[PDB]
Design a protein around this ligand. Structure first.
Ligand SMILES: [Cu+2]
Ligand SMILES: [Cu+2]
Lengths: 28, 28
C-alpha cells in the first residue's frame, strides 16, 4: 500500500506539472 | 507513513481541482 500510494503521488505530481504548463501556454 | 501519504494525496488532489478551476476561468 505504501508503494501504491507513492505511485499515485508521482502521477498526481506529473498531472500538476502538466496543468501548470497548460496554464503557462494559456497566459502567453 | 500511510496516513501521511494519504494526506499528501488529498492535498495534491485539491491542488489539481484548483488548477482546473483556474484553467476554466482562463478559457471562459
Ligand atoms: Cu518513472
Ligand atoms: Cu478534510
Amino acid at each position: 500500500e505504501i508503494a501504491a500510494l507513492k505511485x499515485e503521488n508521482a502521477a498526481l505530481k506529473e498531472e500538476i506539472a502538466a496543468l501548470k504548463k497548460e496554464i503557462a501556454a494559456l497566459x502567453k
